[PDB]
Design a protein around this nucleic acid. Structure first.
Lengths: 182, 267, 336, 315, 315
DNA sequence: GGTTATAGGTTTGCGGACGGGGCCGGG
DNA sequence: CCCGGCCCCGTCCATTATTAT
RNA sequence: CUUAGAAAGCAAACCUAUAACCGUUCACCGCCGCACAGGCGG
């Protein structure tokens, strides 16, 4: 019902990609602390690249909690932020489905460790894994717990006219919950 | 003193498979970007459509291979990027030479067509890991091989961390990273040395195994193309022959019989 | 009349003083080809084809065995054939100039300032004797102990390595010591030194004082003092003096040669080079010039005279001569 | 003053193999593709190559630089500098020469670095000429190409750059070992050929250590290093000479064999590329010809018995 | 007499082969890419080369030095100095002239240096002019290039340098032997060409020693060295002459053959590169043209057909 | 779109004049 | 037998530093 | 009979270490499961 915009200020030190990654992960940690399954996001200017604007959706008091908590403290300067406001009355909707493959090197190593696959099975696994590809917009996320840098992918539904109530899991992307798109 | 004995280098043969072009050279002439092709020139004393892929085969740059292979200060030095891959920092002159040497990955399949794209590709390659460059890390600016500018406590702390990291690679083994103020290479007529860190047999083997492991599972994902390493053959070379595996494959030794050669001694 | 003479690889410089235009001295002509000499103004010589050169070539072509200056003076003959025509001849030079540095030999046999030959004698009595330690020990003292030693002081406790190389290197270090201003101590030691050694004064030609001179004269002083204690006959030369060391300083060649087996180092030569500093050019280098090209020498005469010259050359039968120095120059053409 | 006979020099032909460029010339100013000048392209050492097009601006003074993509490897082939080859041959003692001094000279003089490779000390002006001579190593395969390179930041000055790289390489080379320069060591500064400045008794000691090293090379042989106060070169009319050390046939054989051995097993790992010497053909030349093996001779015969040429005599 | 007949001079063309630069010019001031002059680049000997571009501002007076990379080897070819070639020819005796003295000069006059090389006596008026004349050896191939060099282990004043190097080289040169200068030896101070200071009676014994050396050159031949008190040149209008020694046809033949042999076998190993004389074409010139071989090579005569020219009268 | 950063930009040496004594020649 | 010139060896010398769109 | 004449620029030295020509450096490390089924955590 309420949303906030964050526009990336491109820098010589950090180009739009790195900024996007860091502010996204900071938003993630924010949601981890705030423990809310209800705070969402979208990427309005996305056009094959998530774009330079990250829009957060949710309750006005929660967005106020975000502004006040100053989650993204260091990086405030690269960012330009509008005040919280109610969404416009005429608005379409779309979910955000994080697209992740069921195939990975760790899973292959796991299948070898479980004794579940043959030598040729490894080859067919690799051909099926590297054969597929995602043209979808992605972001490379740095981590701590797993201590890895992993590529997460995003996909969205097309212009659903009606909202569907749902959970926003961790990073704010929603699977089955449609955020306002404008 | 005397002569150096043991395993001089760890060579290997890589055979990989894929589809499409993994590594492109760029757009060169009506014009086309192309892909890296060995021995190709567009100049006549030319049209894009005239090429013989048998004479000028597709290949992947060692640079690309390395980039996707490693996919990645004290932290730099303790990283695999520091130990196996090499590095240079423009400020001052701090560097480390990569013990890893890689030939081109050469496609044996002649399937081209008018961008210029590719069908099924089969790459063959060779490579080596140099024990001399791997086991020793020069911390001294004397020979300008200096990895870092260090403090006596930073010296000892660095040795320790590397020991810790290399330990984190293979828990079964018990690696040793030994710092010393003077390390002299075998064969000098004078005793002159640099402050640095020497790595024990377990550490060196752990690093070699890690590198070979990364090589065996190595895969590259390009928009319209991909590569995965199919087979890998490894040779532990105690001989004076370079690329023994390349010239003669009857003399190859798969499992390590001998301890690694020690090229340096503290003094 | 025209004579076209083509030449390749000819030396355009001359390294000698005096003149080739006049009888050569019993001891020959003074050679300045050395970098020390070439540094001095006037010693560096650049040459070009002149009327003298051309006439020398002509006389060479008619077969004259006399030098040019002898031919011009009608020395051993009646008349000089070209006496009339020498004012009537001009020439046009088409050289291609190349700047190359070349190593030229030095025949005066000058001993090298810093060098020695053969083997060094460490068995020489002056080093291995009893008086040796407190004798050579003077040079190892600092300036203050030396200044105190200059007056009446018999104490030298210095224990040093005895080597010709150690001594000469110590002298090398003492000579590179910066000059000192004249003061109280310097005044007293100057008066004492001038009292003992009146003939020489310790000063620069221009306004300076040097430590090495005081050191050397202190060594002389020690030589004079220790003569009562022991025999200095081994430490001095025939008509005694310290080898390689004067009272105002020292010389490496003489010292070394004295203590080395074999002769002094001869200077076999040096490259021909002059490095000068000119304002706005900065550093400028000058090398030997080697020219290769063709020379048209024109003699203005009647065709009959020209034919006479031609048959004179043909009768002479001279061929393949250098030009001006060290060249290969032949006669390409003859026009009447 | 009779003419010298026996083996004058030991020539050889080297065949080597490798991959990639071992020895690079450096970054060179060239014109980018239709973008005019490019200040970064790395080039290997190419024989006969110039970056100039030989077309000029006349008053401007600019010279038209070649395209980076334009090279003929048949006309201007890839080669490895003699400097590099020599460096990697002697590569174990490489940093030692900087630390040289008189006794340090004593240590250098007996060594593969002292006897075969040459050396110079500027301070004391002490030197020795290297009897080892090597031509260029010339690639006969000639597979080069323009190769584009980049950085992963893909934004700044490191940015994108390029090199002219090489595939499989096959090198051919020639070389020679001079018996005259190898067998004699001048200890005297007279002719400015001096190795080290020596004292009266030290000469024989130095000779002895030399003998020890050369012996340590091949225990089977019997090397002798003989010092003398006067050593005279063949052909002088006044018979004038210098203090030095002469090596006998066996010693010379030991050093030559050591050198050829180092050459035959020579391998270089450099600049992300490698080289190993495949084949070596050797000829012992007693005739007067330099590099007879290079000129056409199918008939050469090396006898085990033929002795090495003696260029000096004691006096 | 009225005319001079026979071989006037022996001309020749030399074709040589080699690799790398045997003879270097030296370090030369050139401009770096930053605009500042770099004082380290070594240059070989190049024909016609200048480092200067001219074109300067008047108030400076400077010369605007060339880039190292700018050289035209067709316009400015590599060459070997005649000085160097001669040096390596006579290199056995190179230091002997320094020890030359009037008394010892007896030894100097009979030798390859005295008869062919010529000589000088220090602090003396005695001389002999060399009958051998040689041009520079000029490279017809011209494979040069800018080659970068460096030192391992440190970055210092010595660490980084460069040279213009060369690959395979083919030299062409010309030269001549003057019978007039060769066959006569002047013992007289009259024309200041005097070889030796002579006391009466010494002529015949000196002649005998010359006879011994020249005979020792070619035992097969029968040389004659004849001393006389007055020697007058033939074709000259001049009636005055000197006491000296004349050599007959056989002696001249021996000296010519010795020279040609030394030239044919000439080889130079210098500065990590080498040169050898491959082919030599010889002309015995009886004609009225000098260096016939250089212009027209069809009129050349390889074997000696006629006797050598006699340039002098007994009294 | 960027179109190389980083240091290193040579090291050493390259005589001779002046005075005294001895030997040889001339008167 | 005396004087002068010439020749050889020992002694004692030492001056300098600039340039680039 | 020319600028008297004879006259090595000589000896020694790794251009060396690092970098996808490309979608934003990076398709990662684990978990549930028989799965080369489908998913989950960061």
């Amino acid at each position: 019902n309420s949303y906030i915009d964050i526009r990336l200020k491109p820098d010589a030190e950090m180009r739009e990609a790195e900024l996007s990654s860091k502010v996204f992960t900071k938003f993630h940690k924010a949601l981890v602390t705030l423990n809310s399954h209800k705070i969402g996001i979208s990427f309005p200017q996305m056009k094959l690249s998530l774009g330079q604007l990250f829009r957060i959706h949710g309750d006005a008091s929660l967005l106020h909690d975000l502004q006040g908590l100053d989650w993204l403290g260091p990086l405030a300067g690269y960012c330009q932020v509008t005040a919280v406001s109610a969404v416009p009355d005429h608005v379409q909707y779309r979910i955000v489905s994080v697209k992740r493959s069921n195939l990975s090197k760790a899973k292959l190593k796991r299948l070898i460790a479980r004794g579940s696959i043959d030598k040729d099975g490894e080859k067919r696994y690799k051909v099926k894994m590297l054969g597929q590809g995602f043209d979808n917009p992605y972001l490379d996320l740095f981590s701590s717990s797993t201590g890895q840098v992993y590529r997460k992918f995003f996909e969205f539904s097309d212009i659903q006219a009606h909202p569907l109530d749902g959970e926003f899991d961790s990073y704010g992307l929603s699977k089955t919950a449609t955020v306002p798109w404008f | 003193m005397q002569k150096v004995t043991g395993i001089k280098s760890v060579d290997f043969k890589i055979k990989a498979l894929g589809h499409g072009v993994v590594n492109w050279n760029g757009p060169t002439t009506d014009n086309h970007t192309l892909p890296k092709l060995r021995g190709y020139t567009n100049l006549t004393g030319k049209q894009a459509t005239d090429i013989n892929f048998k004479e000028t085969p597709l290949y992947i740059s060692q640079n690309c291979i390395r980039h996707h292979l490693f996919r990645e200060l004290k932290n730099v030095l303790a990283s695999i990027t520091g130990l196996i891959r090499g590095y240079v920092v423009p400020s001052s002159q701090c560097k480390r030479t990569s013990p890893l040497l890689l030939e081109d990955f050469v496609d044996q399949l002649g399937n081209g067509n008018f961008k210029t794209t590719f069908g099924d590709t089969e790459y063959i390659s060779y490579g080596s890991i140099s024990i001399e460059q791997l086991q020793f890390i020069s911390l001294d600016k004397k020979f300008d091989r200096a990895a870092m500018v260090i403090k006596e406590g930073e010296g000892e702390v660095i040795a320790a961390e590397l020991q810790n990291y290399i330990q984190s690679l293979n828990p079964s083994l018990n690696p040793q990273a030994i710092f010393h103020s003077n390390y002299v290479r075998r064969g000098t007529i004078f005793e002159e040395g640099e402050c640095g860190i020497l790595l024990n047999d377990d550490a060196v083997k752990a690093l070699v195994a890690e590198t070979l492991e990364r090589l065996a599972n190595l895969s590259i994902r390009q928009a319209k193309g991909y590569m995965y390493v199919d087979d890998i053959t490894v040779d532990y070379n105690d001989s004076h022959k370079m690329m023994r595996i390349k010239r003669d494959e009857s003399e190859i030794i798969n499992e390590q019989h001998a301890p690694f050669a020690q090229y340096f001694y503290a003094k | 009349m025209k004579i076209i003479i083509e030449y390749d690889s000819c030396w355009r410089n001359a390294f000698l003083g005096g003149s080739n235009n006049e009888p050569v001295p019993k001891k020959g002509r003074e050679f300045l080809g050395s970098m020390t000499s070439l540094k001095k103004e006037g010693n560096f010589k650049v040459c070009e084809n002149t009327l003298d050169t051309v006439m020398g070539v002509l006389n060479r072509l008619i077969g004259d065995q006399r030098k040019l200056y002898q031919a011009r003076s009608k020395m051993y003959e009646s008349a000089y054939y070209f006496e009339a025509l020498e004012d009537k001849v001009s020439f046009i030079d088409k050289p291609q100039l190349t700047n190359e540095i070349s190593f030229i030999r030095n025949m005066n046999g000058s001993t090298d300032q810093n060098a020695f030959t053969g083997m060094i004698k460490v068995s020489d009595p002056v080093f291995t004797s009893e008086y040796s330690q407190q004798f050579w020990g003077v040079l190892a003292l600092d300036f203050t102990q030396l200044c105190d030693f200059i007056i009446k002081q018999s104490q030298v406790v210095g224990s040093i390595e005895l080597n010709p190389l150690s001594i000469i290197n110590r002298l090398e270090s003492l000579n590179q010591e910066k000059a000192l201003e004249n003061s109280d101590d310097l005044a007293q030691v100057l008066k004492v030194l001038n009292e003992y050694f009146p003939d020489i004064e310790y000063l620069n030609n221009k306004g300076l004082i040097t430590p090495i001179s005081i050191y050397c004269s202190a060594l002389y002083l020690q030589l004079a003092r220790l003569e009562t204690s022991f025999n200095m006959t081994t430490a001095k030369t025939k008509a005694g003096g310290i080898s390689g060391i004067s009272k105002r300083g020292f010389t490496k060649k003489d010292f070394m040669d004295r203590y080395t087996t074999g002769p002094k180092k001869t200077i076999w030569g040096n490259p021909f080079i002059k490095k000068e500093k000119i304002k706005g050019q900065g550093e400028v280098t000058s090398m030997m010039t080697k020219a290769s090209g063709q020379l048209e020498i024109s003699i203005d005469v009647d065709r009959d005279k020209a034919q006479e010259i031609k048959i004179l050359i043909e009768n002479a039968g001279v061929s393949s001569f250098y030009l001006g120095k060290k060249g290969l120059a032949y006669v390409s053409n003859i026009k009447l």
